[PDB]
């Protein structure tokens, strides 16, 4: 079976270098053009660059062209992409695509994600978004928690260590203009259930080892 | 450099019905103009490749259409695992491009957002820090606006939303905006309030509280 897989994604300060691979299975890679795609949070796909079967021609997009080189080893079944003079533009999941006779992308990976930002490592204050009569509507109260100021990406949620699942948002997070990540996570519940259930927001991340677990009172 | 535009940049369609969306090319690329589906943080997929041609493997609901600057995708009967971004690219000239792409998502009755406001906690406040949470739940069609307004002003720039994806279960969006203020901005105004315009209501809909 045909199967793209890329790595070498991760965070990387703006202006320094890093290099991407693609490990090509199930076909013959000298076989087939090769190409990168990569899709920026909230943005649609973006070519960035072509390379024909033997490696002896290359094409860039305007946004890349100078700063990037696709390269190619047949006998490793490998595409790279060597990123020179990152911008934080250049935040995405790029994409390695198989070429069909330089016409339709065939075939697609699963991505690997690239974070360009001169932010360190940052583990998140979590704060109690907390129910009440302001948060009731139609025999159902809001609550959460504010999952701000961690680098870099994921967090991961949970309500009453997983048992709590019904009427639980997790909104993705976003990106604020310090180069931290924010996100929030809300929960429905009836509003009768306000100050006889307990309610805790079970917050991990990974990047940083850091575990919070908070209280979130009426 | 060849430019594709996609019309519309949004559509809702009703299972088992037909839906067809559009790709416009810049110039004549003829037939070298290809379809994919992407659905959210997942891989891309080939749908139609130089046109009109089904890819091995897409559901026979699946056909393109179309020549020189005028392309067509159709789902014939739409099924519920069709909600996706739908892109065109071409491979007729050198730089390659894709479109901006086609969102289309499960239609479904109108539902107005259930609308809260959150003040900062006392915990975030003491560091300095003043985070106002408007939470906008379940609502369809995703399309929503939030105005923040501190004593009757009308705020800009100091604010950033969030939207989840469509829910597999009812088909709603749900919608999270943060006001950041600092402790000192935050303690020299009186009222807190966001104002939330959607298409299920008639007038739109404030919630507000007094900080002190």
């Known amino acids: 079976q045909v199967q793209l897989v890329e790595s070498g994604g991760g965070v990387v300060q703006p202006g320094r270098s890093l290099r991407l691979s693609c490990a090509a299975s199930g076909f013959t890679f000298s076989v087939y053009g090769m190409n990168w795609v990569r899709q920026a949070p909230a943005k649609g796909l973006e070519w960035v660059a072509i390379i024909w079967y033997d490696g002896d021609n290359q094409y860039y997009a305007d946004s890349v062209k100078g700063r990037f080189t696709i390269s190619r080893d047949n006998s490793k079944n490998t595409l790279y992409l060597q990123m020179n003079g990152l911008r934080a533009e250049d935040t995405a999941v790029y994409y390695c695509?198989?070429?069909?006779?330089?016409?339709?992308?065939?075939?697609w990976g699963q991505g690997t994600l690239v974070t360009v930002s001169s932010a360190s490592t940052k583990g998140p204050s979590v704060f109690p978004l907390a129910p009440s009569s302001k948060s009731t509507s139609g025999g159902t109260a809001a609550l959460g928690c504010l999952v701000k100021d961690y680098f870099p990406e994921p967090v991961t949620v949970s309500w009453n260590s997983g048992a709590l699942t019904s009427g639980v948002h997790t909104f993705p997070a976003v990106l604020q203009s310090s180069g931290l990540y924010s996100l929030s996570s809300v929960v429905t519940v009836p509003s009768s259930s306000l100050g006889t259930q307990t309610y805790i927001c079970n917050v991990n991340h990974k990047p940083s080892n850091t575990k919070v677990d908070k209280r979130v009172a009426p | 450099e060849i430019v594709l535009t996609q019309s519309p940049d949004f559509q809702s369609v009703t299972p088992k019905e037909k839906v067809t969306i559009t790709c416009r090319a810049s110039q004549s690329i003829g037939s070298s103009l290809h379809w994919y589906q992407q659905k959210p943080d997942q891989s891309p997929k080939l749908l139609i490749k130089?046109?009109?041609q089904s890819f091995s493997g897409v559901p026979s609901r699946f056909s393109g259409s179309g020549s020189g600057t005028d392309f067509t995708l159709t789902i014939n009967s739409l099924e519920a695992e069709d909600a996706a971004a739908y892109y065109c690219?071409?491979?007729?000239?050198?730089?390659?491009?894709f479109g901006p792409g086609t969102k289309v998502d499960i239609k479904r009755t109108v539902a107005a957002p259930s609308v809260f406001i959150f003040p900062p906690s006392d915990e975030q406040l003491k560091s300095g820090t003043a985070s106002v949470v408007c939470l906008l739940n379940n609502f369809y069609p995703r399309e929503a606006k939030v105005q923040w307004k501190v004593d009757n002003a009308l705020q800009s720039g100091n604010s950033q939303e969030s939207v989840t994806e469509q829910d597999s279960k009812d088909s709603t969006y749900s919608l999270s905006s943060t006001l950041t203020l600092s402790k000192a901005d935050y303690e020299k105004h009186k009222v807190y309030a966001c104002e939330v315009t959607h298409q299920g209501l008639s007038s739109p809909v404030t919630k507000s509280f007094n900080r002190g």
């Open positions: 695509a198989r070429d069909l006779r330089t016409g339709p992308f065939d075939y």
């Open positions: 130089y046109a009109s």
């Open positions: 690219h071409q491979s007729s000239s050198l730089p390659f491009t």
